[PDB]
């Protein structure tokens, strides 16, 4: 019988990934993991490990889609991956699942060494699970495996356990600081369910990670309300609905970021809000380091209510009480949009994310993309613009579209009490 009915009339897996997984990467994913496609975050982590050997901190709310990020890379290159974890029963479960998928894998510890260690040294295992206690006393073994086989990655699960400041400190994690000393060229993928910026900083310091890629996925973010609205042809007409008059000035409900495509538009929008004596500042790459760091400082100190910025603004901010994100103009693509709205309401309190768009917007202009001479990049950019256009045009649940694109199916299936309600999105309200 038919297992799915996903195909739609007038629509034509790899599309929204840059660069695209190659044919053998997809064959490997189907053969060894029983999946047809990578989710964007899975590909971000996997590609960063394989092609850049880049350290990662991957915050993942649950195990749903998590294991692929550290299991896939060593399976594809046919070398070895190390998984460091204190979760013995889960490690045993994953080892058995790997064996049943015809991936040679084992649990290495003192009591298991007689059975598996010689075979690990001879490169017979793709994936080896070890405790931090065992790992701490065997840096010499890891150096031998790096020399004779090549370690694709070291995964550190429950990575928050390295922080004295967290709620689950393990003495056993302290010595994992030595991994980067012993193995400076082996990328570490640190995994945790804690989205705390403070704990992330502790993990990066304690594991000596170098410019790590930070991702945060597996969350349904029920406190983010999503709306797409047409521009009215006037900045003040467009932004007046967001404003409240108090004393002899206008303000937003709370701390607000307005993302504009152009530097010109950030100055144009700032100018209009300044006329209302609204507490705000501009942020783009055309400003100096001094001015940019001051805008950041004043926003964190709540000395400005609103930052009117290009998408240069965001990565540096850990601010938990962003009440409103406005995309003033169509966003660059759904990837950029997801990164930008993800910064809203990190305190878990009610926030709103509005796109104000026109069919005329620069990020919907095909002319700029047709000028791209590289065929693969041109077609990718056109596919991303089309996907962004489809989101803006949709009458379907905005949350369902974003979760379907970016998250494991479980985030939709585990999402209870927001989708279809008045607080979900404009399309669920109406």
Q: Choose between 126 and 354: whose C-beta lies nearer to ligand A1CEX.
A: 354
Q: How far is the CB of 165 from ligand A1CEX (least distance, A)?
A: 17
Nearest-angstrom CA–CA distance, 330 and 251? 24
List 17, 353, 397, 411, residue binding Zn ion (CB under 5 A): 397
Nearest-angstrom CA–CA distance, 331 and 356? 9
Among 419, 391, 421, smallest CA distance to 406 is for 391
Nearest-angstrom CA–CA distance, 404 and 371? 31
By CB under 5 A, tell whether 353 contacts Zn ion.
no
Q: Reduce the DSSP state of residue 110 to 3 states and report it.
A: coil
Q: Choose between 58 and 145: whose C-beta lies nearer to ligand A1CEX.
A: 58
397 is in an annotated binding site: yes
Q: Reduce the DSSP state of residue 283 to 3 states and report it.
A: strand
Please report the DSSP string for 64-91 in residue order: TTTTHHHHHHHHHHTSEEEEE-S-HHHH
By CB under 6 A, tell whether 221 contacts ligand A1CEX.
yes
Measure the CA angle with vertex 332, ends 209 and 356; round to 5°. 125
Q: How far is the CB of 401 from Zn ion (least distance, A)?
A: 9
Among 88, 80, 62, smallest CA distance to 124 is for 80
412 is in an annotated binding site: no
List 75, 98, 203, 226, residue binding ligand A1CEX (CB under 6 A): 226
By CB under 6 A, tell whether 343 contacts ligand A1CEX.
yes
User: Which of the stretches 98-106, 123-131, 283-291, 396-404 binds ligand A1CEX when contact is defined by CB under 6 A?
Assistant: 396-404
Q: Reduce the DSSP state of residue 129 to 3 states and report it.
A: strand
Residue 403 touches which of Zn ion, ligand A1CEX, none (CB < 5 to 8 A by kind)?
A: ligand A1CEX
Among 1, 60, 59, smallest CA distance to 408 is for 60
List 342, 355, 380, 384, residue binding ligand A1CEX (CB under 6 A): 342
428 is in an annotated binding site: yes
By CB under 6 A, tell whether 402 contacts ligand A1CEX.
yes
User: Could you tell me the CA-to-CA distances from 297 to 277, 281, 316, 377 in Å, in that order?
Assistant: 20, 11, 11, 37
Measure the CA angle with vertex 356, ends 43 and 319; round to 5°. 60
By CB under 5 A, tell whether 399 contacts Zn ion.
yes
**Residues near ligand A1CEX (CB under 6 A), total:** 21
Q: How far is the CB of 203 from ligand A1CEX (least distance, A)?
A: 12
424 is in an annotated binding site: yes
Which residues does 112 contact at the CB level (< 8 Å), separation at least 6?
106
Which residues does 69 contact at the CB level (< 8 Å), separation at least 6?
41, 42, 45, 46, 56, 58, 60, 155, 189, 191
Strand partners, 130: 84
By CB under 5 A, tell whether 402 contacts Zn ion.
no
Residue 214 touches which of Zn ion, ligand A1CEX, none (CB < 5 to 8 A by kind)?
A: ligand A1CEX
Q: How far is the CB of 319 from ligand A1CEX (least distance, A)?
A: 10
List 28, 87, 139, 195, residue binding ligand A1CEX (CB under 6 A): 195
User: Which of the stretches 48-56, 64-72, 81-89, 218-226 binds ligand A1CEX when contact is defined by CB under 6 A?
Assistant: 218-226
260 is in an annotated binding site: no
Please state the residue numbers annotated as binding site for ATP.
Answer: 35, 37, 39, 42, 63
Chain residues in the site for ligand A1CEX (CB under 6 A)? 195, 214, 216-217, 219-221, 224, 226, 314-315, 338-339, 341-343, 346, 348, 399, 402-403
Which residues bind to Zn ion, rule: CB under 5 A? 397, 399, 424-425, 428
């Amino acid at each position: 019988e038919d297992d799915e009915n996903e195909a739609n009339e007038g629509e034509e897996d790899k599309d929204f990934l840059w660069p695209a997984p190659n044919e053998e990467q997809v064959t490997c994913l189907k053969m060894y993991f029983g999946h047809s496609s990578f989710k964007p975050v899975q590909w971000k982590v996997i590609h960063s490990v394989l092609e850049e050997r880049r350290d990662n901190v991957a915050v993942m709310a649950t195990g749903y889609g998590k294991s692929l990020c550290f299991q896939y890379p060593p399976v594809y290159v046919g070398k070895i991956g190390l998984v460091i974890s204190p979760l013995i029963s889960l490690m045993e479960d994953q080892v058995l699942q790997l064996k049943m998928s015809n991936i040679p894998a084992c649990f290495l510890g003192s009591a298991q060494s007689e059975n598996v260690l010689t075979d690990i040294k001879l490169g017979k295992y793709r994936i080896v699970y070890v405790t931090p206690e065992y790992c701490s006393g065997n840096m010499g073994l890891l150096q031998q495996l790096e020399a004779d086989i090549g370690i694709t990655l070291i995964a550190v699960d429950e990575a928050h356990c390295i922080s004295e400041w967290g709620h689950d400190f393990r003495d056993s994690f302290r010595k994992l600081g030595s991994l980067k000393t012993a193995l400076p060229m082996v990328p570490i993928v640190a995994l945790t369910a804690t989205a705390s910026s403070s704990i992330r900083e502790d993990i990066v310091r304690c594991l000596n990670l170098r410019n790590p890629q930070i991702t945060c996925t597996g969350f349904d973010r029920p406190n983010l309300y999503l709306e797409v609205r047409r521009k009215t042809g006037n900045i003040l007409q467009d932004l007046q609905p967001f404003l409240v008059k108090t004393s002899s000035h206008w303000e937003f409900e709370g701390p607000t970021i307005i993302y504009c495509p152009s530097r010109k538009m950030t100055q144009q929008v700032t100018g209009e809000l300044r006329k209302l004596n609204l507490s705000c500042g501009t942020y783009h790459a055309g400003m100096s380091f001094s001015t940019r760091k001051d805008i950041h400082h004043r926003f964190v100190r709540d000395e400005i209510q609103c930052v009117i910025a290009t998408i240069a603004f965001g990565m540096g901010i850990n601010k938990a009480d962003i009440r409103q994100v406005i995309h003033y103009g169509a966003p660059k693509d759904m990837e950029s949009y997801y990164q930008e709205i993800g910064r809203a309401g990190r305190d878990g309190l009610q926030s709103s994310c509005h796109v104000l768009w026109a069919p005329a917007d620069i990020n919907l202009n095909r002319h700029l993309l047709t000028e791209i001479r590289n065929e693969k990049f041109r077609l990718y950019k056109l596919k991303m613009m089309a996907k962004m256009e489809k989101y803006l045009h949709s009458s379907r649940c905005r949350r369902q579209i974003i979760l379907s694109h970016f998250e494991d199916k479980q985030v939709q299936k585990a999402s209870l009490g927001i989708m279809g309600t008045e607080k979900c999105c404009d399309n669920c309200r109406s």
